Amino acid sequence: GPAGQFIRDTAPDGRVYKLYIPSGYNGSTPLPLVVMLHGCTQNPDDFAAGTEMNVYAEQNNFLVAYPEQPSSANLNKCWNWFDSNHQSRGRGEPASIAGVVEDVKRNYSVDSRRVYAAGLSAGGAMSVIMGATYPDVFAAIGVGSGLEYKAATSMTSAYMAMINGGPDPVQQGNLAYQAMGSHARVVPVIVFHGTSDYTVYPVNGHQVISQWAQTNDRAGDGNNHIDDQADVTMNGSVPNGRTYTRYLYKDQNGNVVMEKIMVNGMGHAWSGGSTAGTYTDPAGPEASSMMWSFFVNHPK
Ligand SMILES: [Mg+2]
C-alpha cells in the first residue's frame, strides 16, 4: 500500500543515478543508503526491477541509489573494474560513485554510518573497489558474482581474470589496504556467487573473500586477526529452489566480518529476485534480503 518514489537525478559530475525514497522518509531520521551498482548491459531501472531492492528499501525504511554506467563510459555498460583509472580514490568512477553518495547526503538525511555498496558482476567488482577506496564512506559491501581488488589492471587482462581469477589474493589484499590510505578500517563483505557461473567463474568469489581477509586483517593493525578460514559452514536449501553453502568468517573478537554464499548450479545472476529484471535467478536464496541483513548488522 504505502508507496515511495523512484527519482532520477544527475550529480554535479554528470553521473546519472536513480534514487528510491521510501514512504517512511520524513527527513527527521537519517536513513541508511544502499548504493546498488548494476552489472554489464544493465541500467538502474533493470537492476532495481530484478533485485527488488526498492521493495526492501520500502519495507526497511532505507534509501537506494543506482548510479548509471552509460554506454559512453564502457562499451558494455560495465563499471570499469579492470581499469587502473577506475581503481583509486579521488578520480574516475570511484570518485563519481562517492560523488553520488555525497549528492544524496546533501539532498536527504542519510545515516553516515549505514552507507553500503553492493552490485552484480562488474558492479560487484566496483563495490570491492568502493570498499578499498572509500572505506570512510561505505560501512560494508556486497559482492554478487564479482572479482577481487585489481583482479585485472587493464582491459587486456580482464577476460582472463573473469575465467581464471586474479593474482594472489593476499597481495591484492595488501594493495586494497594501501588504497585505503589513512581511511583504512575493516570493511565487512558479503559475497554471493553461482557455482555454474560461466561469465565470472566462481574462483573469483573465493578470491574476493581471501583478498578481503588480508585487507581487513591489515586494517586492524596499528588488534583483531582475520583470516580466510571459514569459522562456520552450513548447507542451506531453498524450498523448490536451489541449494547453497554459507561460509562465515569471524575475527578474533567474535564478530562476523565476512560471509560467502555459493549457490549450487546458479549461473551469472543475482540470487533470488524477480524475472522483472535481467540477470536474476529466482530459485536462488534471496541475496537482496541476505545482503540487507548483513549490512544493517555491520554499521560503520
Ligand atoms: Mg577464521
- Domains observed in the chain: 5-295 (3.40.50.1820)
CA distance 102 to 116: 13
User: What residues contact 212, with CB distance under 8 A and at least 6 apart?
Assistant: 128, 131, 148, 173, 176, 187, 189, 258
Residue numbers belonging to the annotated binding site for Mg(2+): 227, 229, 231
User: Is residue 121 among the annotated active site residues?
Assistant: yes
* Nearest of 70, 69, 71, 60 to residue 31 by alpha carbon: 60
Q: Which amino acid type is present at position 223?
A: N
* Nearest of 277, 282, 289 to residue 267 by alpha carbon: 282
Give the CA dihedral 69, 70, 71, 75, nearest 10 degrees: -20
CA distance 87 to 170: 17
Q: How far is the CA of 150 from the centre of ligand 1 (A)?
A: 24
- Residue entry with cell 593493525: 221
Q: How far is the CA of 256 from the centre of ligand 1 (A)?
A: 9
DSSP-derived secondary structure for 168-196: -HHHHHHHHHHHHGGG-----EEEEEETT
Structure determination method:
X-ray
In the set 96, 121, 210, 288, the catalytic residue is: 121
CA distance 120 to 271: 10
The resolution of the experimental structure, rounded to one decimal in Å, is 1.8
Taking only Cα atoms into account, the Rg of the chain, rounded to an integer number of angstroms, comes to: 17
Contact assessment for residue 172 and residue 211, using Cβ atoms and an 8 Å cutoff: yes
Q: How far is the CA of 261 from the centre of ligand 1 (A)?
A: 16
Q: In what order do the strands lie in the sheet with 256-263?
A: 5-10, 16-21, 63-67, 31-37, 110-120, 140-144, 189-194, 256-263, 243-250, 232-237
Residue numbers belonging to the annotated binding site: 227, 229, 231
User: What residues contact 90, with CB distance under 8 A and at least 6 apart?
Assistant: 133
